[PDB]
Design a protein around this ligand. Sequence first.
Ligand SMILES: CNC(=O)Nc1ccc(C(=O)N[C@H]2c3ccccc3C[C@@H]2C(=O)O)cc1
Length: 167
Amino acid sequence: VNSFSGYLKLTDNVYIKNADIVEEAKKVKPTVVVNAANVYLKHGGGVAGALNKATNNAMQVESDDYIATNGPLKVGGSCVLSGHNLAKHCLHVVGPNVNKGEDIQLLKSAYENFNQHEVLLAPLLSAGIFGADPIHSLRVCVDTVRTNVYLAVFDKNLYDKLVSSFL
Ligand SMILES: CNC(=O)Nc1ccc(C(=O)N[C@H]2c3ccccc3C[C@@H]2C(=O)O)cc1
């Protein structure tokens, strides 16, 4: 039993809710919140900008030190950093950005990072400003992630479309 509330169950291990991931993180304090990161951990907009703003820029400060030490992430890769006031940990995962021309097949590799964590609160990777089809992202999530994932979808219209079209 966990504290996630109001989710629709899609499969054995995937759950979905129309919610603001920032507000959801603030209320649940999950062990892991996933950030829709880029390789430079520059949290300017989308989910990343929202999560970082909610940390009063502490996420960005920590991220800049991480990059200065380790260099950029790979597309499809991830790193674990602090969750600050939102979660115990933040798993920064880089899905391909279609608006940068990155290979969508890398979306499966990106979701594989979730399997290293038993339970996660997450957005749909590569959705929103990353330019992928969220219906496709949900399909890859369901077919790749085996651990327990609670997906937060900010847009109610998109949420309803994702549920209604789910196979
Ligand atoms: C004050 N609170 C807030 O600003 N919250 C806030 C702001 C923006 C987003 C967002 O862009 N999310 C989408 C996003 C972004 C980048 C990559 C993939 C996805 C999928 C997400 C979705 O469409 O569900 C989510 C929450």
